Structures are given as C-alpha cells and as structure tokens.
C-alpha cells in the first residue's frame, strides 16, 4: 500500500509528458488498493 501511494505521489510531482506515456500507468495503478484494504478480501486471497 505504501509503495502504491508513493508511486502516485511521484506522479504528482513530475509530468505526464506526451513523449513518454509511462507515468499515466502509475496513476492508474491506484485501483489495486481496493483488494488490499478490505480485510475479508485479504483473507480470501490469502486462502487462494
């Protein structure tokens, strides 16, 4: 979770330049917290 939030804030500093389409992906990567934050989903994924 800390790694994801850190990457999003790194995107918050620098620029989504049109000559390098990398940094939009770290902004889109924020969604995966929606699994890790719910403890029930953490339990089920750890059971898998």
């Amino acid at each position: 979770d800390s790694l994801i939030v850190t990457l999003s804030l790194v995107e918050l500093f620098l620029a989504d330049v049109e000559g390098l389409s990398v940094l939009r992906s770290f902004r889109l990567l924020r969604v995966f917290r929606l699994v890790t934050a719910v403890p029930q989903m953490r339990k089920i994924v750890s059971a898998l």
């Binding site: 330049v17 049109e18 000559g19 390098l20 389409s21």
Partner: protein
Amino acid sequence: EIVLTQSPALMAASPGEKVTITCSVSLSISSSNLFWYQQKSETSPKPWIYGTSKLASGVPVRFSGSGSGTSYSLTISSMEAEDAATYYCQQWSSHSFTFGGGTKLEIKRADAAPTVSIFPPSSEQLTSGGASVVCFLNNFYPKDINVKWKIDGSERQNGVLNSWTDQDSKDSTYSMSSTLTLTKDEYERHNSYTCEATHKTSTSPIVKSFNRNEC
C-alpha cells in the same frame, strides 16, 4: 489544439541539389503518430511516410527523414525534376486531425526573355458595346515579371486582368495573360495601345502593340 508550423513556405532547387524541409511543432509529441503527404498538380494527395521513419510502397530509396522530440524533417538526397510539388505534415491529437500549411518546391533552368503577342478585340464584342485587349506572355523564366498598359503614352492600370500558370513539366518556364477590357466608346477615342514586358533578362522592355490600321 496542437498546431503545426512549416519552413520554408517556398524554396527552389536544381537536379543535383540536396534539400531538406521542416515541420515545427507547438508541443512535445512522440514519434509514432506523424505522417507525410505529397500533392502534385490536380491530384488528390497520397500517403508518403508512415510513423516518421518508415517508407510506404512505391517509394524509391532516395527518401528519408528522421529525428525525435519537437522538430522533424524530410530530406531528398538526389532530387529529381518530378519533385516539384507541395508537401504536408500531420499530427494526431486527443480527438482531432491537424495538418500543416504547405511546402512547395520548384525546378530551376536557364533564363529567357518573355514571348509577347497582343490580340485585338473581336468584332462580336464591338457589337456588344465592349472591347477587350489581351496581351499574352508565354514560356518565360522565372515567374516574376511586371507588365504595363500604354494608351497613347498614358499608363493605364484600370481594367487589368492578370493570371499566371502552373510550372510546366516540359521546360520549367511560366506563362501569363494580361487583359485590358474597355468599352466601345473608349476604344475609339484613342489610337495606340501598348503592352510591355519588364523583366530582369532584358533592361529594355520590348514593345508589342497594335494600331487602328483598318481598325
């Protein structure tokens, strides 16, 4: 939206000369979407370079242009005489197309004097109450030329119809027509009508005229 700007708008060359055009950008844009086009005389344009370095089919190997970032180019190494046309550069946006301005090239050959022949108005326009004095100037190089109209020495600039020509593929010269339109009463109040040709190839403008001898 994004806008493009070209340089130069006009530039000429000879076979054996290596030329390079520019397509300047207004914001930093990746290489994978930028395209070239070529338009001859009275032809709908054709795709020329896909993806800023790769050529299309039906293209000889004398054509390339590269770079990155905010400035691009197209370089013809051994320029033929059929490369006298107009180019275009394209860039894709959020959801809009944006082409360029236009980039025209010309073929150079030797200098020449203009060939001048003036025609009288026909008889049927005289019945219609009008008159039209046409002074043709055909097959001259270069394009830049200036003409005058002299009616008994009076320099008239009213009633002048000028129109140039496309660059010929046969000889790379130019042609031009200048028309002096009058009325029926105005055409009979004077005698002499003189069109001249002022050009850099002869410091004396030659005179091709007509009189009212049986007119």
